Amino acid sequence: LDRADILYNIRQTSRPDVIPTQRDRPVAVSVSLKFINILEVNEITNEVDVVFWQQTTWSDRTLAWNSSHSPDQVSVPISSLWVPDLAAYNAISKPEVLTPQLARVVSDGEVLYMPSIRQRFSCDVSGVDTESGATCRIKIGSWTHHSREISVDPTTENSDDSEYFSQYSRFEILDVTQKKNSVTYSCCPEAYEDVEVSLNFRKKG
Amino acid sequence: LDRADILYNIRQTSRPDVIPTQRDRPVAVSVSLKFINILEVNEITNEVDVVFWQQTTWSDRTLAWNSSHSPDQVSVPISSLWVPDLAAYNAISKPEVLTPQLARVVSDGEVLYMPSIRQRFSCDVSGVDTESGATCRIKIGSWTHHSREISVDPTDSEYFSQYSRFEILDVTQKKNSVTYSCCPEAYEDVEVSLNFRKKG
Amino acid sequence: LDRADILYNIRQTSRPDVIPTQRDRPVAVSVSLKFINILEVNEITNEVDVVFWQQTTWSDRTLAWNSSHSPDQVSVPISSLWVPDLAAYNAISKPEVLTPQLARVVSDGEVLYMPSIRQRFSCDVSGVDTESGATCRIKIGSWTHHSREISVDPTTENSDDSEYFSQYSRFEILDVTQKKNSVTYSCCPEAYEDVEVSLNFRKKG
Amino acid sequence: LDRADILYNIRQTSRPDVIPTQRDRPVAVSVSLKFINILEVNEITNEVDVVFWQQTTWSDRTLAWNSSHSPDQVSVPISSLWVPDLAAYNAISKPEVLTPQLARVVSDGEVLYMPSIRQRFSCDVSGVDTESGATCRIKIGSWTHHSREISVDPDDSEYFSQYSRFEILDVTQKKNSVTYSCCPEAYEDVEVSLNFRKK
Amino acid sequence: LDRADILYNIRQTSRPDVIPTQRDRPVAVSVSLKFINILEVNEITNEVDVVFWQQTTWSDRTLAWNSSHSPDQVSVPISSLWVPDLAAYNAISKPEVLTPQLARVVSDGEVLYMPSIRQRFSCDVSGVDTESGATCRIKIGSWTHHSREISVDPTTENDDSEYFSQYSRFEILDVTQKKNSVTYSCCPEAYEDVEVSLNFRKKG
Amino acid sequence: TRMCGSMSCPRNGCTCVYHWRRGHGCSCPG
Amino acid sequence: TRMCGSMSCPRNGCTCVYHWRRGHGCSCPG
Amino acid sequence: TRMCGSMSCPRNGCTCVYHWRRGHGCSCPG
């Protein structure tokens, strides 16, 4: 198979508006934020303006192809694929995507989408000028699917907190933590899952 | 039916640009605003910048399914269904929709659309710095369908950011009728009253 | 007929990129600007930001249907219809449409489009702080069509300074005036029509 | 022919991504700026924010029709037509088009497109507060086509806003032909000089 | 062939969402920034606002045609063509494209795309007020492709080469372009970028 | 009658204008 | 008049330019 | 010659990098 053939098969097989649940098990989405920059902090409005890479992955086995004598991956426009309907529950601006809107599809059906995103959040910004610093919490989950349809887990990773953080930023990263929540109601046997990302940062100086 | 089949049947059956009136009753739209944050307030200009989840629901019986081996709900892009043409009569900015443009269809034909919206309003902003606070009204209703075609009904600030500069004293939601000299018919709305103040 | 049938016939009959002239005769467009709010003023640049409802109507009798046992109107996305190419000749920003992009078609062929528009105009803004106030002039006409294709007239009203104008605005309306202009050139027998709306407003004390 | 027929034939015949060169010869585009307003000026940064009508015309003879017993012109969306790929070489913002994107096509194949545009420029700026004033130059030409494909050729205050902080002393429009050592063909622009000052 | 024929054939044949490989060699992309203006600089925030021409070229052999008795080039909308997925790793705003989105296609299959772009970067900026000046580095590479799919090289390499305004508050001391190749012990393929270094200062 | 270039104007209270292709014109009220 | 790199300018009043692929050039009046 | 993690760099003048999925790497000139 060549790259054109792979892209053709992916288009025929991917239904961008249909979650690729396989035998009604949930699609396992993994997500992790890598912070690149913290741009503006606002004492008055309690807003922080942040740039981050959103490492997002999931599997759609129906996309798979045999990769002996064929490329093992391709890059595919996201409009040709189902992507999870992730949202930051407490974002106060729309996410500005800075990068080409392409995902990487592996021959086994794994999908890797890592947009660079610029977005404002609500933050307690008083302690930004203190030793302990301020903390921004970003809560990310599926906007419309519960836990029987999408599961959301923090990727477990090594790389330093500030590994890709601009050294020319006015702020420094003290700590990033990424933990999972399940909100569950007496209504339903299913839960709503999110990843809570905590960004502990302060001004240098 | 699987999710793909449901979406297929919805596309065959749904007319996204036709109000799903059945049998000359108005289509009953229920709307409720859950406030997430208040960003900027201006006592001088009477402008407020607000983030809210607009919980919208209605019924479209033609979307229902009853088949065995089927999900109880699906998520669908809004371009695949009729959604009400709601507008804030007193907005002074275009609504910035922050979330994916998907609606939830329940197998009984109920539709749930809950966008997170950021929007500026012209509003009574008096006493934001006082104990009693300010009370800002948001009027939401159908832009083009009058009260014989769409009705609007309202449906505990669990969702409000604790890192906001303001706190919510009270939200109340009443039903009303707009009329203007342009148009001979009346348009139902929900008037949402947001009583809030600066934290001290 | 049901609503879907009506919308089907409207799409077959209305050609969005063809003016619906019926024989020789011009499409008669009526327009009225209803001011909702005056938002931002700039002393330095002499710009004013204005929100207004642009009440626009016209007839396309070929859209008409018998309504006695059918809906008397429908709401139709504007991309399915011809709408006039109206423009504010002297705007200094693009018009931001704030409302759903739908028009009303009545069973007699009348078309009603009333977007809420936010747009910047050039204004004397020192005078906004004076007793006499400032005046913002908005000149509206067809951008490309002359009077034998589209005629543009101010709607006949029964109204006010306002029931439309926000009572929470920093400004108050002293006066609104509406005149028509008909511009003719010695080359050509046709006229170019606009409606000039003058908004005299000032700060409340 | 009626208006619908004309628009149908224009769509069949116009190829919006194909320059309508007739034989070897260039499409002759004429362009002229009418200034409506100058909004913000910055003597420090040398940035100016300007609104202007860009009167643009050219011919595409393949669009022509017989106009006895038919309309002599029609209005056509520009997405149905080839339009020249004009750009202001020294703009520092994207052009905000303020008006409906329609052109006028005459039955002889002449095309008239006149968008109102708001755009920021890098510009001299000095002496805006003086009697002589400042002069801002705007250079407009084809972004990708040379002179064998497109040629570019050229009252004052008649549409200039009465509420502007500035007044127009003079506008002049001259043509340039730039030639480069690689190629025998030239790149044509119109240089518009706007001499203005504070009132 | 006339221009219309060429544009018709280009629309058939070109796959805008498929990298135009030819015989599983990488597509060789060459890129260079030409700076036109530096608009805002911030010593406090380390943000710079820049206007630049992004000179980009590559080949797509499938577009080629015989050019005797035919035009040797045409202009083609980029929505009809594959374009490389380049990105500035340290951009903090979306790139605002200021110019018509057309590329030049040569009869041999070469593509020349030179958008004028306005973009903000996070950048050093410290000695902007000094004789030596500040240096802003911009790192550009393919967002999703490695070196066996796309290779990225600086175009054969120039300075303030009579692109830069003269009405700007700043002057260009030097622009330099170097290439990097990042390789990991997992994988045989490399990840390529071009580092563009803009050394500029305030006049006065 | 008000005269704009070579043109005599249909009506009262007019006003002169010039269009870059169509020539001298009369902008007339009402 | 002007020499602009390897280019001798066709007339008077010409200024210099460089394009990264087309070379040194003369921007000329008329 | 530079070692990045367990990896020996192909040539001199290389710097070290760590990618969250690919591991230790060498960023090399040329």
Residue numbers in the entry:
A (entry chain A), C (entry chain B): 1 to 205
B (entry chain E): 1 to 155, 161 to 205
D (entry chain D): 1 to 154, 160 to 204
E (entry chain C): 1 to 158, 160 to 205
F (entry chain G), G (entry chain H), H (entry chain F): 1 to 30
Passage from the reporting paper:
αD-conotoxins are 11 kDa homodimers that potently inhibit nicotinic acetylcholine receptors (nAChRs) through a non-competitive (allosteric) mechanism. VxXXA, VxXXB, and VxXXC from the venom of Conus vexillum were the first D superfamily α-conotoxins characterized. αD-conotoxins are 11 kDa symmetrical homodimer proteins comprising two C-terminal domains (CTDs or C) coupled through two interchain disulfide bonds formed between the N-terminal domains (NTDs). AChBPs are naturally occurring soluble protein homologues of the nAChR that show remarkable structural homology, especially around the orthosteric ligand recognition site formed by aromatic side chain residues found in nAChRs. In this study, we describe the allosteric binding mode of the granulin-like C-terminal (CTD) of VxXXB bound to Lymnea stagnalis acetylcholine binding protein (Ls-AChBP), a soluble homologue of the extracellular ligand-binding domain of nAChRs.
The crystal structure of Ls-AChBP in complex with VxXXB-C (21–50) was solved at 2.6 Å by molecular replacement and refined to an Rfree value of 0.29. The crystal structure of Ls-AChBP in complex with VxXXB-C(21–50) contains one pentamer in the asymmetric unit, with the electron density of VxXXB-C(21–50) detectable adjacent to four of the five orthosteric binding sites. However, only three binding interfaces generated clear ligand electron density, while the fourth binding interface showed reduced electron density. The F-loops of Ls-AChBP could not be constructed due to the lack of clear electron density, indicating a greater flexibility of these parts of the protein. VxXXB-C(21–50) binds to the C-loop of AChBP almost perpendicular to the long axis of the pentamers, making extensive interactions on the principal (+) face of Ls-AChBP. As observed from the co-crystal structure, VxXXB-C(21–50) anchors on the outer edge of C-loop Ls-AChBP via four hydrogen bonds between its β-strand backbone and β-strand of Ls-AChBP_C-loop and β4-loop inserting into the binding interface. In the four occupied orthosteric binding sites, loop-C of Ls-AChBP moves outward (10.23–10.90 Å based on the measurement between Cys187 Cα atom in the complex with HEPES/Ls-AChBP structure), which is a similar backbone orientation to previously characterized co-crystal structures of α-conotoxins 14–17. An outward displacement of Ls-AChBP_C-loop, which is characteristic of antagonist binding in the orthosteric site, is also displayed by VxXXB-C(21–50), suggesting allosteric antagonists can also inhibit nAChRs by stabilizing the open (extended) C-loop.
